[PDB]
Amino acid sequence: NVKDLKASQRVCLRSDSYMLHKVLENKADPLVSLMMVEKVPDSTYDMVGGLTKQIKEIKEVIELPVKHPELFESLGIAQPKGVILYGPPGTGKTLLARAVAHHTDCKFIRVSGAELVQKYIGEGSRMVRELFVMAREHAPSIIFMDEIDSIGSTRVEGSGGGDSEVQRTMLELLNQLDGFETSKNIKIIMATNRLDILDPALLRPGRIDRKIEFPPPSVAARAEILRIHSRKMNLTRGINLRKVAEKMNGCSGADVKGVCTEAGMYALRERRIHVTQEDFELAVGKVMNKNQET
Amino acid sequence: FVSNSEILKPFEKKQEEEKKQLEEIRGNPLSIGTLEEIIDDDHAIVTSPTMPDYYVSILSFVDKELLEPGCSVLLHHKTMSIVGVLQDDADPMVSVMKMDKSPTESYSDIGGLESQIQEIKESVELPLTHPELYEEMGIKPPKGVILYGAPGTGKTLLAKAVANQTSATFLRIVGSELIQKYLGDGPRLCRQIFKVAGENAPSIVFIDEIDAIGTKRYDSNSGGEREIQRTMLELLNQLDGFDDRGDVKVIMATNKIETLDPALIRPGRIDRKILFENPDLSTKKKILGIHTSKMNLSEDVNLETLVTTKDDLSGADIQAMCTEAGLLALRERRMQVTAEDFKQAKERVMKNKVEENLEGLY
Amino acid sequence: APSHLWDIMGDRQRLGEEHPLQVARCTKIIKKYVINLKQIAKFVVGLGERVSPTDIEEGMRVGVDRSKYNIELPLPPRIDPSVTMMTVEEKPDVTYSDVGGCKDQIEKLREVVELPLLSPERFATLGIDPPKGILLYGPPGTGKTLCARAVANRTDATFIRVIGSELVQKYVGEGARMVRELFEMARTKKACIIFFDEIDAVGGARFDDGAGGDNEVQRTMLELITQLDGFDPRGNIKVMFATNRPNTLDPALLRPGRIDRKVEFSLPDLEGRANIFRIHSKSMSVERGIRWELISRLCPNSTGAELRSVCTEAGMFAIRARRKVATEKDFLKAVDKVISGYKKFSSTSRYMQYN
Amino acid sequence: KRIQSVPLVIGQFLEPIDQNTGIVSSTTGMSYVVRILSTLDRELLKPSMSVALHRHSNALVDILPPDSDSSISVMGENEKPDVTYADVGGLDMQKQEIREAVELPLVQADLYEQIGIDPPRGVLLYGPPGTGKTMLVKAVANSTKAAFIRVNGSEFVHKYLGEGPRMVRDVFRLARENAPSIIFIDEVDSIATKRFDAQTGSDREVQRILIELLTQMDGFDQSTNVKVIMATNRADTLDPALLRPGRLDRKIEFPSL
Amino acid sequence: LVRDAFALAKEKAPTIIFIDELDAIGTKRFDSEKSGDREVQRTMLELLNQLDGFSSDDRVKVLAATNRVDVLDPALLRSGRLDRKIEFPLPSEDSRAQILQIHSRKMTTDDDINWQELARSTDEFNGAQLKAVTVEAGMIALRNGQSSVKHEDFVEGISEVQARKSKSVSFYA
Amino acid sequence: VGKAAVVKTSSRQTVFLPMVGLVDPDKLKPNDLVGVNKDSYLILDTLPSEFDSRVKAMEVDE
Amino acid sequence: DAFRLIDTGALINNLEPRQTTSNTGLLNKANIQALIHGLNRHYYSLNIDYHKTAKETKMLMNLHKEQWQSGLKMYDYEEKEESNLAATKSMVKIAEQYSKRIEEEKELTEEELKTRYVGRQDPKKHLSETADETLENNIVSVLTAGVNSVAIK
Amino acid sequence: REMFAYAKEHEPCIIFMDEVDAIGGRRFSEGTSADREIQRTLMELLTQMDGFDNLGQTKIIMATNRPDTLDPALLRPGRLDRKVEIP
């Protein structure tokens, strides 16, 4: 019967009389060209070192009202619209957004600009607001804007162009959920390199109620980042984790794993599965040259 | 007994016989298509998404008044006959994005504009809800209003509360979505918005944050210098190219209407100019009392102190200090927010972005 | 309701195979007809049973049978035009007497447009050529389109509305097709009216350097001029060009051969602005004994858009000021409101003329 | 079993639905939902596995062997022993990063398992137009005597739309099936773009090629045998999603100046 | 289109091809922004290739009509494409007198009009501006109820503002 | 080898056929549009004095 | 498929469902499945059966039953082996690997008395696939030995 | 791909190109108006010279009004080795 039929359901259409047979499956979550939606990601707090001071900050700011929506509602504080984290690019701040959705059982959704330009009739302006309408069907997850910052694998650290136009466009729609549905399940977390990327319009940041500063990588910060990924094999405790981080100058979180790759590079030439103290001095010397080159 | 047997019995029997005749029309050999043109001979040419050509007659239940070019009719697989008129197949899928039915808004959050609120009510809310006002006196109601002022005054919230009283569909338009650059395409999207408003006739047309391209300010969608001419003049050609007495009311709003084309203003359609100003200290207690109604305040916290501290602030800045002061006590797990959090919130939010003029005393 | 009035004929015109013809266009006529299908397939057929040898013409859609190709019924040409099918309206709103006052703009248009259509034999005595095109630009806000719709009412024929942004399409080269769609219906439907709206977005001379992607705009007028005056002087209906930027147009567009009668709207004087309040005095509420000539004298020279706003705003004072009808006191308040209050933008007032 | 015999239709598996029932994609361009022959099983096939179909009913019959079109099918050695790496010198700066992201995993794949470091799956070649080359890339396959597959960027799009994504899955698949291979794609910039994809739209979709390049790249490159090499030009526009560590790692620019 | 245009010059050898607005198709557009268009120059290369092909038997002669010489492809002129460059300046006194007389042959006048005086009343008018003289001359006698068009109707019809007249500009004096 | 003509249908399908006696090899031209059968796709009708077509806009005015 | 005109099939014409195999059309599937019940016109009731005489019976048995082996005897045995000489030694060796390679994959699921690799259909996969392989080896063993046997010095 | 495929069976001879102003452009994206099919034409011409097939016997004659409109990848050595001016 038609009572069990609904939209976005793959069914079996007879090839003889052209009639409906039965229901096969539903429509997959990814749509259009590439749709990346990750529910309960693999990013945790134990895999990200040195940000413990910053992790405690984003836990009571971002994660706290999202995991417990009844706090700000009972205490009389309005629901936070969005939170931006500014700091040095390339440190992998996107992994922090994936860690919040992991503990809150939310979905990690990226907004890509490659699909903002597509060939359709009447849907050209929809793709900007499509990810906002679809997010209502993705449950109260957290939306992260893709390609707004450089984690070291990407480009375009920031701009005052259409990249910042889509940011304030989706945040403006947050007041619509309170006007029509009278409930706002959507919260957007973003990361930029500088504060000038945002558009100084609509005086005061009513769209972003919390501005969190990202600490630059330091000796004590990169020490815990290394130790997580440092050991794929035998290591010794005679080497200092702070001495290795002291040699790195301005190396972001992604560049710390470069030392881990160079730690096994010299061990691969000798076909040795152990790393002695002579390899640590040679590993840091190659990374300092690779960071300054290109 | 006598009437029920000669009415209810043949009615239910005839409806079952009409469905049996649909097997040769609406039966399994059924397809769709796109209507092109109609001729007085009761024949038309319809093209399906597979791009065929079908020239056939017109069946029952539908006349030619409902058949319009560009719509989607219903076809047949074998006899290939046109069944009847139908709506857009799968629909445009535009339901609630910039439009809705009855948004929830009140006059408390927009308070302080009451001097300029009576201007938009008499020109919009009064003629739409009470049409007998201008009909008995014969006067012509204002066909539109223009909105100008500093942001944060509740520009969108001003017309949002009026839409709830009119009990009609409230349309909105983004300034950046019409100037989108594909190839041209600027004027093409503008016609589709006003065309939907003509069929159902909501009698409400509003545009939020008119931008287009003043100078650049875009990357992905630019449009060049030719987009400025085809966009800003397209909104003019809607009021200038059609004469609608009592139905379509176009309302335009943005931050600055001075840099806009004086032709885009279209004088004589908009007879009312509404200016926006920040609310005074008398109306701040109404907005502050709503957000603090569910908030736990200490004994040393006074509502009259926070209002006096606020100087040249918008409506969102009142709830911002309550949000900032609420998060300070939430991190420390406190029931009643201490007065120290309110003091640190009103002082910090006051000066954040621009502390100094950076040069001279001005 | 008419369920059974149709299916009775369903055993002849439906069950049998006649109508399901494949629509296709004929190319060469040998008197063998070479016809190209919409699927890009070519073939040759002859005449039909009821087909006349003079009906089939070159460049015309001819429906052929899908199984065994044969000519059965001819079809009207140019099935591709779609958007232009919605440009035809009927029974407009603004009448001939809705234009405030009687001035030279009304008398000059009716003689070059309404006169040859209503009385085609008047100019045939002298054996002259009536002007094909006209010119209406003027400053905005003067009711330019209000005077153009007054002519369409007296004509009682097909009115073609052409928007300046309609010529520019989303495909390169499609703009040239949109021009031929306008002049093709002129031969199909005789004695109609076409009206251009804001040709400044298309019409103009942009020269060459400085853009590199704007050459698509100038190619539309060069086709529009060819379709207007080509190698063959083909034309019937009158043509109306209207835009708010006359100085930025093509300097050749203002030359004779297309537009003959040139009528530019001017700011109404004390005598011109007096009839604006008189035509609006029949509407709304006017107190007995009020002289509108004194109200128009206090108002300086401005566009007609602000003149109609005075009578409209005058009725708005009665609600706030607690008045029954519109009095003289509320008329003076409209002078400080509609004029003195709006002196910040919201007007042209010799703003856009050349630059 | 002998009813179908020779008259079979080439097809490719898509997704499983029901027991002995699955949907496939025929080379004709019409996807039908049919059943699976009782002698076969859903576990005996793969999502990228090719199957045989009936002429009319297009029912699944037999599982095709690991072979397909892939434009011109190359076994990996055609007149390869010609030029060596010594013919073009001065590449020691560039070749040092190539040998560690190509030659080493092609010979001994257990060295990367002992170091616990993820070896780079893909390889890119940067630099302005006119880089020459077409020597060292072939020289690696010549010196190691391994399999080599060369598919140009314009060869991924078949004359039919639906065949495009079916041929892309076959390029990465044929390399892993028989022997360690090397996938070379010359001028792939016509597919991978930065937010201009399909030149602000073209034809109908045209994006079916880029979807399979991103999806199939993560599915393969496991045993650390086949590697992907793509040489492009400088448009100053590149796909950051391809550059993510979970897909492609090695990025090598030509030592200009 | 261009390929099939000269294809009809094969079956029928002595034909005539006319191209209106030669400036409509051509450009350079390399250095500056937008990278040109190339949806135009395609059909321009056909004009160069076809005239250098089986054509140029001097039965293919084409009449090229354009507005100005300013914007054009410098490669459009060759001994195998276009030879004689025919300039069309504004008609002279005796040239305008004969043009104005022909357009008035279908009208009704008193034969008192001397076109030698009207030829000097017309100052640098093209062929289209001369045709508008006889059109407006008939409209003046039509609105006034005149049975014939006298010599004063031609002078009144020519006179109109246009130009720089009705100056709101300063200076003058 | 033998004389044989290869035809390419307007549906983009290549059909091989032996030399038909109704036409001559000198009359048959490559890349030419000739009348073909709907079923056998054999060459029957000759060239109707037109290479391809006039496309859309063409003036036959004398 | 044949055709029989029913003329008027409305009421009281004649009874088709008598002769043989009538009342077909179960559900929507009949033949091509598009005809279903009504078929062409008023249910012409397609039925076709064949027949064979005494001469046609002995003709087909001596000509074509499955394949034609008649007319010559010892060539079909030798030529099948001669063309397969290099193939038989190869096919015995090639199929020898694929026989155990299947036995070395699915069979390892069921080993102990309890569950280890969770075999479900795996023990039945290698049984049915290698059932004919063990049979074909015994067939070619007798054919290769039989042709070279039977006298011929 | 055709002209270089027929060059082996029909002998290398000479292949001629007549007035190509199009494929040699960088073609920044305005939407390109369906001309993306021309982009793969340029890619095929560039990969052919650098292809592993045997070449050098077949001569490619490419004439144009001005050289700058041609692809700078072609003008550089490795593909077009001969620039002959006719002043």
From Swiss-Prot, chain B:
Keyword check for Nucleus: yes
GO cellular component entries: cytoplasm; nucleus; proteasome complex; proteasome regulatory particle, base subcomplex
Keyword tags: ATP-binding, Cytoplasm, Isopeptide bond, Lipoprotein, Myristate, Nucleotide-binding, Nucleus, Proteasome, Ubl conjugation
Protein location: Cytoplasm; Nucleus
Domain of life: Eukaryota
Family, per entry: Belongs to the AAA ATPase family.
Protein name: 26S proteasome regulatory subunit 4 homolog
Biological source species: Saccharomyces cerevisiae (strain ATCC 204508 / S288c)
Organism phylogeny: Eukaryota, Fungi, Dikarya, Ascomycota, Saccharomycotina
Gene name for this UniProt entry: RPT2
Residues of the full protein shown: 75 to 436 of 437
Swiss-Prot record, chain C:
Superkingdom per UniProt: Eukaryota
TM segment ranges: none
Signal peptide residues on this chain, from the entry's feature table: none
Keywords for the protein's UniProt record, in alphabetical order: ATP-binding, Cytoplasm, Nucleotide-binding, Nucleus, Phosphoprotein, Proteasome
Subcellular location, principal: cytoplasm
Residue numbers carrying Phosphoserine: S52, S119
Binding locations of ATP: G138, P139, P140, G141, T142, G143, K144, T145
Localization of this protein: Cytoplasm; Nucleus
Post-translational modification: The N-terminus is blocked.
Protein family (similarity comment): Belongs to the AAA ATPase family.
Function, as annotated: The 26S proteasome is involved in the ATP-dependent degradation of ubiquitinated proteins. The regulatory (or ATPase) complex confers ATP dependency and substrate specificity to the 26S complex.
Subunit structure: Interacts with UBR1 and CIC1.
The protein, known as: 26S proteasome regulatory subunit 7 homolog
Gene from which this protein is expressed: RPT1
Residues of the full protein shown: 77 to 467 of 467
UniProtKB/Swiss-Prot annotation, chain F:
Gene: RPT5
Localization (cell): Cytoplasm; Nucleus
Name the record gives this protein: 26S proteasome regulatory subunit 6A
UniProt PTM: N-acetylated by NAT1.
Family: Belongs to the AAA ATPase family.
Residues of the full protein shown: 113 to 174 of 434
TM helices/strands, residue ranges: none
Domain of life the protein comes from: Eukaryota
Organism: Saccharomyces cerevisiae (strain ATCC 204508 / S288c)
Reported function: The 26S proteasome is involved in the ATP-dependent degradation of ubiquitinated proteins. The regulatory (or ATPase) complex confers ATP dependency and substrate specificity to the 26S complex.
Swiss-Prot record, chain H:
PTM description: N-acetylated by NAT1.
Function: The 26S proteasome is involved in the ATP-dependent degradation of ubiquitinated proteins. The regulatory (or ATPase) complex confers ATP dependency and substrate specificity to the 26S complex.
Family designation: Belongs to the AAA ATPase family.
Protein name: 26S proteasome subunit RPT4
Naturally occurring in which organism (per UniProt): Saccharomyces cerevisiae (strain ATCC 204508 / S288c)
Gene it is expressed from: RPT4
